[PDB]
Structures are given as structure tokens and as C-alpha cells.
Design a protein around this nucleic acid. Structure first.
Lengths: 61, 49, 85, 50, 52
RNA sequence: GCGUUGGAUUGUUCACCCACUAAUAGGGAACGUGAGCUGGGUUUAGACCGUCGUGAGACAGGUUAGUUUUACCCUACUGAU
RNA sequence: AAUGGAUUAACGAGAUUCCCACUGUCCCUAUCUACUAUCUAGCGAAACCACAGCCAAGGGAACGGGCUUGGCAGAAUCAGCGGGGAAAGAAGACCCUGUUGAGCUUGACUCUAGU
RNA sequence: GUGAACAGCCUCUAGUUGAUAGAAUAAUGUAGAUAAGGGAAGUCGGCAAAAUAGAUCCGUAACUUCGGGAUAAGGAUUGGC
RNA sequence: CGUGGAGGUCAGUGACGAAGCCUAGACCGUAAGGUCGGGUCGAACGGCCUCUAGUGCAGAUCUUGGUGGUAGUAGCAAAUAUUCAAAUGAGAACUUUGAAGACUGAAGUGGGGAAAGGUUCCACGUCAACAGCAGUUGGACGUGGGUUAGUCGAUCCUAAGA
RNA sequence: GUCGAAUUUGGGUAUAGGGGCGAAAGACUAAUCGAACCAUCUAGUAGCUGGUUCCUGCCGAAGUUUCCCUCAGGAUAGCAG
RNA sequence: AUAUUGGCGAGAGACCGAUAGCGAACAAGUACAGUGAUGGAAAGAUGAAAAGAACUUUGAAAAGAGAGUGAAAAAGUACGUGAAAUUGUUGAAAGGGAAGGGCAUUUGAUCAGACA
């Protein structure tokens, strides 16, 4: 448990986590802001075009 | 055994975070070495290239 | 020249395992151990070495015989056997 | 060194039998504060000095 | 204790750029070496005015 | 406004010729310009000759040999979205 | 003038001057290749850091990124660059002090093994 | 095998095919080159590069401790059948 | 005014929540600081009259530990060089076989040893960490297997010397 | 540069800190040498540098005298509580 | 009668409470460094009791989500409480070559007391 500051109805919501994942931190932030607030089925088509060099993840910070 | 084989993986985690390559890698590093910091190297024969 | 290429030539031991103390300090060319005074009769110790005696005085070993001396005194160095009262 | 003494070979035997991880049944005992073998030795890492 | 804190063989290094003058524990390999000693502010040192 | 050089002898600027040219004007910018270059000369430790000293050594002095090595940072500037 | 002086064949990674041969050292710059730099996937440090970053003038620990009066001033940034940031390698190799040393010398003082 | 040769280049036995890779081909670099005409005018200074190079025949100066100098210098030549 | 311990007292407070901590919520004092509410937390602790000290930190190129900007940047450019299919697997520029291209070119990137190392040799299993990319592979991790002498050495002899 | 010897090198052994060893540079003696490293005396001494931890109230200075191997400091007088 | 930082057995404290006290509350003169003489750390705390998370579902796997044990998973063998530097996400505000500060008020948010 113990999620971040969330404002939603916990009945109609699922969730997932990953701990201790050996990635880069600065890359996983920018690829998570690029997908935030999107429709989920548009999100999964989006990430499959990132691997094919069609649409790119923007780096903001 | 599944009680005992999971505890060998609980008790391994502290060495893996310090990237110890085993239970026999106990390489203790000096806090400060002498030959980097103790010297005044002026005109003349110097302490390295 | 005097550093990392001259450290490649180091493959001849000066000291080996001692029989009295087992310390790897028995110097070969002198036939004498620099830590435990061997083969002289007196074990090497000095009063400038304060930690040097705390590593090698009594009680650090097993004490195969001294650990029973303070018990045999308290009964009075008695002989014979028990009674079965 | 392939021409070793028996005084030298007698100490490699003790170094081989100390070269083992901790037994899995000592994990389970009462008031076990022993977790990992800490005097464990590798040949690549730490020389044992004869 | 009358010898508490002095069970150490430290020595000053000298006047470089990136180091102070507090006498440092000589030796190597242990991770205690290269640390401060004999000071009242040093970790592992004696206190000021050891009580009698 | 525009233009004021090419060479010859010493680390050398100092000091002075040769020829061309329309003319070979004078200065400043930490006696512009070493984290641009140069180490030629300026300042260690080696060594010789000369003077002085009983001596270690110093020189009125001469000759030769010789280690300081970023830039990826913000600004400036030249370019680019 | 064996504190050694004059001479000289041969030899020298020793010091200096010139002549032929030769050539992008130069007049005067041009071009080609490899590997970098550059862009991407994975991996991913260090020096340094009071606070930080646009200039002119004035005063001023004697030559301002900040003070005072002016000129100005539009987000976010990529590749070059070496003017400045008294950027950085050295509580300075330079010069004075201390009733601080060490090494070396002599009919300095006080002694000492030896003879 | 070439060759005076255990030089250098190429292959058989035996052994590896490991060293972060992809895409582009700006500057400035690092390593290696070629340049018309002139030929040290460059520079503290011919630094660096270029030129000479193996072998056979001819030829070879001052100087000298007679041994050297000497590969002195300078020329003619080099395949295949 | 505040901190650690001491004697006294308030028959002080407390598992119906003591101490600690967080708190652009409130109150008192010029100020050192004191008090209250809310949040978390789980076992002790405060007022006052006095007694004692190892008692108040921003600095000492302070000491030990922890973390930043720099920065997803410098970089990972010596030793001529890799490529196609298949197998295995969740996943292959890197593993195995085959096909092909090259090198060390025998003063080897070959085959044996002395010094030194001490199980690295070999098999089965197997990938969290390590191999500055990767990994199903390994000198890594887990469990085992393995070194056979009248003739080779040591043992014996003497050298400089101890 | 030198490359048949004043050559190069393995193992054995000898010399140990005011000592060794040196075809001589004050060289070398375990990344340390114009006197090795280790521990103790030791918390050596500094007339020199740096730091010194809570608040408010009241009063509030001196760079001058004479003496000192005294001139980056003391003793005395003055000023202050 | 007097001496005692050693040995052996006991009793204590206006002493220290894990950077403190011996170097060592822990497999400490241990790990590790050095040819050698010698040098020498770091590291205590789940709960009353392991009752240490059966089973289901997604995933190659670690794990995730459910479920469940307990007074509590805001205690899950990275475990009592869990501060700061530093960082993520959500909400509010500002931003023409720094930022922060003093006096004064507007605008926004937020909040205590009292009327008898």
C-alpha cells in the first residue's frame, strides 16, 4: 500500500507498483510524464511507437 | 526448505546493494590516502608524472 | 621505474610459518622469528608494545590446564573418589 | 606451486573445508543472530598468505 | 579511564590543500586509517579534562 | 577616411645598414597579448674555468645541461533552432 | 706548469659556424584517408562551489558579478570557442621575522672514544 | 617461399575470431600522405620532413701514434627469356 | 531562559495514549523561550523550593556518517573485423553447431615447466550481485567428482656462508 | 646508444640507521633518504596562525610612560569596572 | 600494621546509554592492510507469540493486485519511533540579465476570541 497523494474513488481504480527496478531514474521520470493523464489504450499504442523510432519521448527537466 | 531458501535471499540483499560480488568480497577502502593529500610539490623533483 | 614496473619482480618470500607461534614471521636467512623470539628460549615481548602483549598473553588460548587450577584449589587439592551417600 | 611441502598442503585442506556457505538449518534455530558466513574466502579476491 | 582514547598511533600529515592538521591514523586497508584521533572533537578521541 | 614593407648581425628589444616603395610617421590598451604559442633568455638540484676564502662555500664573473599538465561550467563572442 | 700545462691521430645520442644535395619550414594555402568529436541504444564519473552571473563611469585596501547615477532588459536551449570569471595546479620556489631546526666546515666555546 | 638472415611481408600444423555497438562524414584535432613555380627568403636555431640506402665493377684527399682515415668523396650498372 | 543526573514535594500526568517527531493553526513574553489544538507514534514522564556538571554552536582548510548542483555531461576511440542460417530461450551484435570472411605466421595469440597462486582443473544444476554495453555464457553462485611411483623430484653430499 | 664482453640475468649467501653500500649523483637502502621504517617517552615546546556554543539591563576603554639580548612579547604607571 | 591498573570470587555508584562507555554491548584483537616489526575498524531493537503472508489472478521470473494472520502491515526478515540535507507527484502563487530582507497597505487564502 502507501501510494502517493491521490485524489480518486478507490472503488473504480486499479493500481500497480515496481520496487528496486534497476533502470535510470532520469529516464523513467521523463517517460512517465509523457504518458500522464492520457487514456490508457492510447498509452499502449504510444509506447509501441517509441520503440520503433516514430514518436519520441520529450525531455522536460 | 522453502522457508530456508527464501532467508538466504532475504539476508543477501545488503551486500547486493553495496555491489559486493559475493560473501568473500570484503574490500575495505581507506577514508583518505596519504599520497594524494600530504605534500607540497614545488620546483624540483615531483611526486608523480 | 621505481614504482609499478618494479613491483613486478616480487616473487621471493622472506618469511615463512613459524613453529612456535604460527605467525608467518620466521625469517629464512636469519633462521629466527621476528614476532615470537624463536628459536631463543624467551618469548619476545616489550613494554613499549602494549597491544603487542594483549594479543599473546594468557587466557587468549584454550588454557587446557589453567582453567581447572582455580577449581581444584577451591576443593583443597583433594584425592580419592566420591562417596554415594 | 606444484612442488609444495606437506606443511603447506595441510593448510590448503583447512582452507577448502572452510570454503562453504552457511548451512540452511542454522537459519531456523532459536535466537539465531547469525545470518551469513563472514570469514568466507575467494581465491581471486583475497590471498590467504601461505 | 586513564588511557581511554590514547590507544592509537596517529601522526599529523602536514600542510596540504585538501586536509586539516589533526593527526591522522596511519596504516591502510581497514577503513579506520586516515581518520582523526587524539582530539576532543574527534570521533573516537578522549574528552576534554578527563575526570579524575 | 585609407596606407605604412621585404631582408642582413646578438635571447636580445637597445643600438645601426641593404634594397624596394607614393611612404617605410609616432604612440596606447597590466611598458596589449604564458589556463593562445615560444621556454630561445628569466630562477633549484649535475658539471667545468676565473677571482676571494685556511675551510664548508660565496661570486667581479663566464660556459653548458635542464617537468606545471584544466575547460564539460556561467558570461562574452561566431554560428543554430 | 701533476691546482698540471702546450700539442695531436682515432672515437663521441657532447657544444658552435658555414657549403653542395634536398625539400610545404616559408611565399600561401589547398586537398584525400582512418579513428574521434557530432546524433542515437545501454552504461555513466570528477575538479570546483559563500551567493551567483549584461556593461560604462565615479568613489574605494591603491584596477567591481553586487554599492551610487546612467545604457538597457523576453521563456527554454544545441555546436564551436578561449576575452574575462584576480577560473586551477603550490598555507609559494621569491624577500623579512623567530631568543624554531637540520646537514656540512674551522686553532669558535665545552668535552669525548682512541693513541 | 623471397633474402646474407631467427629482419620485414605471406602461408601449412595448432590456436583465437575476445577489446560496447548502430547511423551520419561539420569545424578543431590525433595518426599518415601528395603538391605547380621558387628553394631556408621561415626560424633563437634547417626542429621536422624530404633526399641517400642492398649488391657488383671502377675510384678514393688532407691528416697520422703507420694500425687507420674509408662505405671517404665521386661515377657506370641491376628485369624477363 | 534552557539540557543531562540528585534530595524534597505536588497522595502530579499516563495504554481512554507517556516521550519523540511533523505542523504559511492559536496564545503569552522585548528576548533567550514557555503553552495549546490537529496529525503520526506506543511506554513512560513534568511543575516547583533547592543540590551537582562531560550543560546551550554557523564557522576551527573542524571530526565521523549522509546527500547535492556539476550531469544523463566528460566519456566507454591503442593491439587491422566481422557476417548469414539454424538450435536453445520469455528475451540474442555477444551463447552452441554449420556455412563464409580474416589474423597471430612457429624469437606464435602454439605446445611444456621454475617462482608465485591454492582448487581456478572437470561435470551437474543455475543468473539477485560481478564480467565499466549485454548475457541463456563464464576463472561468478549452489552441490559434488578428481592428483595412484623401488626408477622423475625431495630425502643424501659439499660451495660462498650459517 | 650498445650488442662477445669492465655484458646481461635466475637461485643461494654476506653487509642494517649516525649504520650499510657507492666506476661519486648526496646517489641508493620495499612508491619514503643532506640520515629508513615501527612502537613507547608524548597530550614534546611555540613569544606564531585558526576557532571559542544562550538572551536582555547598566557602566565603559587603550595604542602612552620608565625598565628588559626588549621591537609580533612581558613587568610598571595611566585609563576601566 | 603497609603495598596492588595482574589473577580468582563477591558487593556497589548524584558515572557513560551505541559517533558516548574499553579498540570490542554483536562469531573483536575478528574482518582487512603490510615482506616484517606492528597498524586495526564497521556492525544492538519485527511482534506478546512467526501466527514469516495458504489459496486465487496477471507476469519468463523478481514481484504486483486481491485474500489472509495480528491490537497494528502507518511493524512484511530492506523490519520500533523514522528528523534534515536531497527527490518525486498533486494543489496554490510569482517570474523582461540573480535570489532572499526592513517599513507600509491593497488583493488572495486562512484563523482565534466575544454579543447576553
Amino acid at each position: 500500500a502507501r501510494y502517493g497523494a491521490t485524489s480518486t474513488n478507490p472503488a473504480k481504480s486499479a493500481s500497480a507498483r515496481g520496487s528496486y527496478l534497476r533502470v535510470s531514474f532520469k529516464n523513467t521520470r521523463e517517460t512517465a510524464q509523457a504518458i500522464n493523464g492520457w487514456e490508457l489504450t492510447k498509452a499502449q499504442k504510444y509506447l509501441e511507437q517509441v520503440l520503433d523510432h516514430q514518436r519520441a519521448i520529450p525531455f522536460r527537466r | 526448505r522453502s522457508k530456508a531458501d527464501r532467508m538466504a535471499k532475504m539476508e543477501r540483499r545488503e551486500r547486493n546493494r553495496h555491489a559486493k560480488q559475493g560473501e568473500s568480497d570484503r574490500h575495505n577502502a581507506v577514508s583518505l590516502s596519504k599520497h594524494l593529500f600530504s605534500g607540497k610539490r614545488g620546483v624540483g623533483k615531483t611526486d608523480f608524472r | 621505474g621505481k614504482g609499478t614496473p618494479s613491483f613486478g619482480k616480487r616473487h621471493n618470500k622472506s618469511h615463512t610459518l613459524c613453529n612456535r607461534c604460527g605467525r608467518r614471521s620466521f625469517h629464512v636467512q636469519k633462521k629466527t622469528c621476528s614476532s615470537c623470539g624463536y628459536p631463543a628460549a624467551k618469548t619476545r615481548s616489550y613494554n613499549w608494545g602494549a597491544k603487542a602483549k594483549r594479543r599473546h598473553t594468557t587466557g587468549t588460548g584454550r588454557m587446557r590446564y589453567l582453567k581447572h587450577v582455580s577449581r581444584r584449589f577451591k576443593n583443597g587439592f583433594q584425592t580419592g573418589s566420591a562417596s554415594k551417600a | 606451486a606444484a612442488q609444495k611441502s606437506f606443511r603447506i598442503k595441510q593448510k590448503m585442506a583447512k582452507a577448502k573445508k572452510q570454503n562453504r556457505p552457511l548451512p540452511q538449518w542454522i537459519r531456523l534455530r532459536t535466537n539465531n543472530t547469525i545470518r551469513y558466513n563472514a570469514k568466507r574466502r575467494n581465491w581471486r579476491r583475497t590471498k590467504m598468505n601461505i | 579511564s586513564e588511557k581511554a582514547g590514547h590507544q592509537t598511533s596517529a601522526e599529523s600529515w602536514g600542510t596540504g590543500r585538501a586536509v586539516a592538521r589533526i593527526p591522522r591514523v596511519g596504516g591502510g586497508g581497514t577503513g579506520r586509517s586516515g581518520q582523526g584521533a587524539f582530539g576532543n572533537m574527534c570521533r573516537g578521541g578522549r574528552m576534554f579534562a578527563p575526570t579524575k
